[PDB]
C-alpha cells in the first residue's frame, strides 16, 4: 500500500471505473446489470463530463 493505491480504491468504491482500453469511463451506481458508459472523447467538455458523472452518482 501507498497513498494513490488507497485513493484509487476510494474512487472505485464510488462505482466509477476507468476503462482506458476503450477510451471510456464506466459508472456502476446500482450494481444491477445496468451501467452508464462515458466516452473520453475531447469532444464533450470537462464541465459536461463532471456534471454528467455527479448526476449518475446521485441516482
Amino acid at each position: 500500500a501507498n497513498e494513490n493505491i488507497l485513493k484509487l480504491k476510494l474512487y472505485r468504491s464510488l462505482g466509477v471505473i476507468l476503462d482506458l482500453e476503450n477510451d471510456q469511463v464506466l459508472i456502476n451506481r446500482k450494481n444491477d446489470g445496468n451501467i452508464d458508459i462515458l466516452p473520453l472523447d475531447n469532444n464533450l467538455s470537462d464541465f459536461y463530463k463532471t456534471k454528467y458523472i455527479w448526476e449518475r452518482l446521485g441516482k
Partner: protein, 90 residues
C-alpha cells in the same frame, strides 16, 4: 498509466481531490471543484464522522450528512449530498 496518473484522471473527471485533513480526527479532506472552494473533512472511523467544512454547514445539514455516512454507509451518496450542499452554500 501509473496509479498517480489514474488518480489525476479521476480528479479531472470528478473534480474531486482527496487530501490529508487538517484535523487529526477527521483526517480525510474531500475537495470539490477547481479551487479550495468547497471542502469537507471526515473520519473514516467512528460515531463522529463529520468534521469541518468550507462553506460551513448548519447542524441540521451536518446531521443529514452524518447519517448518509454512518447509517447508510454510502460514500458516493454522501459525496453527492455534500457537494450539492457545499456548492449551494457558495
Amino acid at each position: 498509466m501509473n496509479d498517480a496518473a489514474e488518480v489525476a484522471l479521476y480528479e479531472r473527471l470528478l473534480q474531486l481531490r482527496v487530501l490529508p485533513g487538517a484535523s487529526d480526527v477527521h483526517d480525510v479532506r474531500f475537495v470539490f471543484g477547481d479551487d479550495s472552494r468547497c471542502w469537507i473533512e471526515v473520519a473514516m472511523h467512528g460515531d463522529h464522522v463529520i468534521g469541518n467544512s468550507h462553506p460551513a454547514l448548519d447542524p441540521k445539514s451536518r446531521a443529514t450528512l452524518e447519517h448518509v455516512l454512518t447509517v447508510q454507509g454510502d460514500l458516493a451518496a454522501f459525496l453527492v449530498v455534500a457537494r450539492d450542499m457545499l456548492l449551494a452554500s457558495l
